[PDB]
From a paper:
Class C Acinetobacter-derived cephalosporinases (ADCs) represent an important target for inhibition in the multidrug-resistant pathogen Acinetobacter baumannii. The class C Acinetobacter-derived cephalosporinases (ADCs) play a significant role in antibiotic resistance in A. baumannii. β-Lactamase-mediated resistance to β-lactams can be overcome using combination therapy involving a β-lactamase inhibitor coupled with a partner β-lactam antibiotic. Many ADC variants have emerged, and characterization of their structural and functional differences is essential. X-ray crystal structures of ADC variants in this study provide a structural context for substrate profile differences and show that the inhibitor adopts a similar conformation in all ADC variants, despite small changes near their active sites.
For example, ADC-30 and ADC-162 differ only at position 220 (Ala220 in ADC-30; Glu220 in ADC-162), and ADC-33 and -219 differ only at position 222 (Gly222 in ADC-33; Asp222 in ADC-219). In the apo X-ray crystal structures of the variants (resolutions ranging from 1.24–1.89 Å), the Ω-loop conformations show more variation than in the complexes. The two variants lacking an Ala duplication in this region (ADC-30 and ADC-162) have Ω-loops with nearly identical conformations. In contrast, ADC-30 and -162 form a tight turn that restricts the active site with the Leu216 side chain oriented toward the interior of the enzyme, and the side chain of Asp217 forming hydrogen bonds with the main chain amide nitrogen of Gly214, both presumably stabilizing this turn. Overall, the B-factors of atoms in the Ω-loops are elevated more in the Adup variants, suggesting that the Ω-loop is more flexible in this region of the Adup variants: ADC-30 (loop 20.4 Å2; B monomer 21.0 Å2) and ADC-162 (loop 23.0 Å2; B monomer 22.3 Å2) vs ADC-33 (loop 20.8 Å2; B monomer 18.8 Å2) ADC-212 (loop 21.8 Å2, B monomer 19.7 Å2) ADC-219 (loop 41.4 Å2, B monomer 35.7 Å2). Overall, the variants that do not contain an Ala insertion showed little to no change in their Ω-loop conformations upon binding of the inhibitor MB076.
Numbering used by the authors: 1 to 359
């Protein structure tokens, strides 16, 4: 006797709302999409000092969830014939031809297996010239293709090459090509002056208001800002790729194709992928220190999971994000906060909600 919208709101109140007080989080947006119906739940303030409530217009930083858009851009360029994932970066960034990094192929860059790229660029690598010099001075460590080490410079370089192959800056790849193709009208690499009123403050661990600062190859690694409606639309596209023209449909499918495994995690393009149903521990393991911060041997896919799910966490200094979707259940969920909370809490709360919603 309780309508489905209320049942979903109750589950979000039970599992996500307590996080606001536990982690002193000013604002949160949680969305669920099920069977093409969208449910949006907003809590708290996008700006504490302005007493401005979080709402459907609130723009949040996606952090590493941005890599999903970079992966989609790569799938689009590949399916248009602009790149092959077997190409090396010097084919497009000519200044890298005949350098050691030109031995790594695009898929290895997108999926973090160059064997010598860390989580972040060095602090002093700032300018375009400094980024190029960094890649020219790169030298292999581990055998190329054997070890996964999660890396912003790695997928950032992939993104730059994708942009080169499409003859536009990366920001314009997303804002002029990818976002319009996915029907996202409130998603940005650079938030225009006319929308800054909707851009939430992030909040640091001292609850002080902040927003992301510029950095090297920031756009492809962690550069996107979006709203909850737009992120529900992005989940919708991933749930229904057959609803887009062939090139974008194939681009989306490319991001869903698992490439190798590390234990129970399948590395797709941008997305992490898992057999469904996935135990909670499987999902937590994907965000463990061992997987996120250390190098790990990759193995070929053995079980190609027929029934599967995908997720991705992301953070910036002042924001947290989690997105997850389950194709055969026709369901997905997005969480956006303007303060980081532990990845494990995001995964746990989403797991409880998604498993309890009636089919």
């Amino acid at each position: 006797n309780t309508p489905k919208d209320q049942e979903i709101k109750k589950l979000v109140d039970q599992n996500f709302k307590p996080l606001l007080e536990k982690y002193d989080v000013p604002g949160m947006a949680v969305g669920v999409i099920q069977n093409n119906k969208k449910y949006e739940m907003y809590y708290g303030l996008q700006s504490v000092q302005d007493k401005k409530a979080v709402n459907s217009s609130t723009i949040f930083e996606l952090g590493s969830v941005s890599k999903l858009f970079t992966a989609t851009a790569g799938g689009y360029a590949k399916n248009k014939g602009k790149i092959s994932f077997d190409d090396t970066p010097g084919k497009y960034w000519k200044e890298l031809k005949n350098t050691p990094i030109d031995q790594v192929n695009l898929l290895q860059l997108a999926t973090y297996t160059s064997g010598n790229l860390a989580l972040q660029f060095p602090d002093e690598v700032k300018t375009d010239q400094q980024v190029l010099t960094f890649f020219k001075d790169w030298k292999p460590k581990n055998s190329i293709g054997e070890y996964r080490q999660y890396s912003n410079p790695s997928i950032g370089l992939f993104g730059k090459v994708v942009a080169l192959s499409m003859n536009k800056p990366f920001d314009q790849v997303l804002e002029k090509t990818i976002f319009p193709a996915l029907g996202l009208k409130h998603s940005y690499v650079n938030v225009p002056k006319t929308q800054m009123q909707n851009y939430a403050f992030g909040y640091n661990q001292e609850n002080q208001p902040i927003r992301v600062n510029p950095g090297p190859l920031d756009a492809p690694a962690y550069g996107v800002k979006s709203t909850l409606p737009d992120m529900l639309s992005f989940i919708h596209a991933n749930l229904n790729p057959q609803k887009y023209p062939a090139d974008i449909q194939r681009a989306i499918n490319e991001t869903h194709q698992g490439r190798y495994q590390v234990n129970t995690m399948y590395q797709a393009l941008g997305w992490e992928e898992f057999s469904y149903p996935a135990t909670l521990q499987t999902l937590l393991d994907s965000n463990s220190e061992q997987i996120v911060m250390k190098p790990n041997k990759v193995t070929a896919i053995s079980k190609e999971p027929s029934v599967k799910m995908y997720h991705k966490t992301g953070s910036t200094t002042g924001f947290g994000t989690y997105v997850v979707f389950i194709p055969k259940e026709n369901i997905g969920l997005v969480m956006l906060t303007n303060k980081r909370i532990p990845n494990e809490e995001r995964i746990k709360a989403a797991y409880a909600v998604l498993n309890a919603i009636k089919k």
